[PDB]
C-alpha cells in the first residue's frame, strides 16, 4: 500500500522566560523516527526508531543543522506574527509546521504538503498543485506575497517530489520489517448493566497497525450514532494502536446490535454481536 513521511514542529513563545521552545518530530506512516527538542542538553536530532540508528554521521549532522536552523527561523516568525496581528509581547503564542510526502506501492510520488498554523489555526499552506499558496487571513496574505516573490513554492516542490520521496523510499527499505508490516485488530465485546432497564455494550479493537481503523454500530442492520460513544484511537505504547466504540442498549435487546470493524489488515470486515 501507500506510505507517508511527515515532520511536525511546534514553536511556543514564553514571554520574559527567554527563547521560545521548539520541538520537532518525524514519522514514517504511524511510526515516529526522530525528535528534536530545543530545551534538551544534546542539541541534536535524535533517533526514535531502531531502523534509523544505522544512518551515518553525515546524516545526523545534516539533520541537526537543518532542524536547529528551522527553530531560529520560527523563533523570528513568532516575532513577525506578533507585529502582523498587532499583539503584545506579553502573551504566549504557538507556531506549528507540517511537511512531507505520500508515495504509492510502486514508490512513486502521490502528494506533498507544506503548511503552517498560528495559535492553532491555519495560517499558510502549499496547495496540492505545489505551485501556489492558501493564505487563511490578511496576515498570511503578506507572507504569501513574500513567498511568491522568493519562489519558495518551486523550491519546496522540487524537494517534495525528489528528496522527500527518495528519503521515504530509503527509510521504508531500512525499516522494512517494522514499516511494511500490517497487524490486524484483535477484537472482543464487553457488557455492563447501567440499570434495571439498560446496559452498555463496548466493542474493542486492540494491537493493530497502522492506526487507521473504522468501528461502527448498527441496530437491526442500520447504522447508529444515537447513544453511541467512540474514543480517539490511542497508542498501546508498543507500536500498535487501540480503539473502542460503545452503545447504550435496552436490557435484553443486546442481540439486535452489531459492531463492524474495518482495517487494512483484514481481508473482510469483522462483525461482533453479544
Amino acid at each position: 500500500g501507500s506510505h507517508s513521511m511527515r515532520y511536525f514542529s511546534t514553536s511556543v513563545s514564553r514571554p520574559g522566560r527567554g527563547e521560545p521552545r521548539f520541538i520537532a518530530v518525524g514519522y514514517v506512516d504511524d511510526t515516529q523516527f526522530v525528535r528534536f527538542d530545543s530545551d534538551a542538553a544534546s542539541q541534536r536530532m535524535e533517533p526514535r526508531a531502531p531502523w534509523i540508528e544505522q544512518e551515518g554521521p553525515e546524516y545526523w549532522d545534516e539533520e541537526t543543522g537543518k532542524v536547529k536552523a528551522h527553530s531560529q527561523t520560527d523563533r523570528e516568525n513568532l516575532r513577525i506574527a506578533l507585529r502582523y496581528y498587532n499583539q503584545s509581547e506579553a502573551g504566549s503564542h504557538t507556531l506549528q509546521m507540517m511537511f512531507g510526502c505520500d508515495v504509492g506501492s510502486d514508490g512513486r510520488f502521490l502528494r506533498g504538503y507544506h503548511q503552517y498554523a498560528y495559535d492553532g489555526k491555519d495560517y499558510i499552506a502549499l496547495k496540492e498543485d505545489l505551485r501556489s499558496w492558501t493564505a487563511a487571513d490578511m496576515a498570511a496574505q503578506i507572507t504569501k506575497r513574500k513567498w511568491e516573490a522568493a519562489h519558495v513554492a518551486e523550491q519546496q516542490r522540487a524537494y517534495l517530489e525528489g528528496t522527500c520521496v527518495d528519503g521515504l523510499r530509503r527509510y521504508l527499505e531500512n525499516g522494512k520489517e517494522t514499516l511494511q508490516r500490517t497487524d490486524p485488530p484483535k477484537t472482543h465485546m464487553t457488557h455492563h448493566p447501567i440499570s434495571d432497564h439498560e446496559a452498555t455494550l463496548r466493542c474493542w479493537a486492540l494491537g493493530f497497525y497502522p492506526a487507521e481503523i473504522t468501528l461502527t454500530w448498527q441496530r437491526d442492520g442500520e447504522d447508529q450514532t444515537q447513544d453511541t460513544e467512540l474514543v480517539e484511537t490511542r497508542p498501546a505504547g508498543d507500536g500498535t494502536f487501540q480503539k473502542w466504540a460503545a452503545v447504550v442498549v435496552p436490557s435484553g435487546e443486546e442481540q439486535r446490535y452489531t459492531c463492524h470493524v474495518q482495517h487494512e489488515g483484514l481481508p473482510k470486515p469483522l462483525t461482533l454481536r453479544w
Partner: peptide, 10 residues
C-alpha cells in the same frame, strides 16, 4: 529528510 527552511520567513 527534514526540510530546507531558510526561505520560510513570514
Amino acid at each position: 529528510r527534514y526540510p530546507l527552511t531558510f526561505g520560510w520567513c513570514f
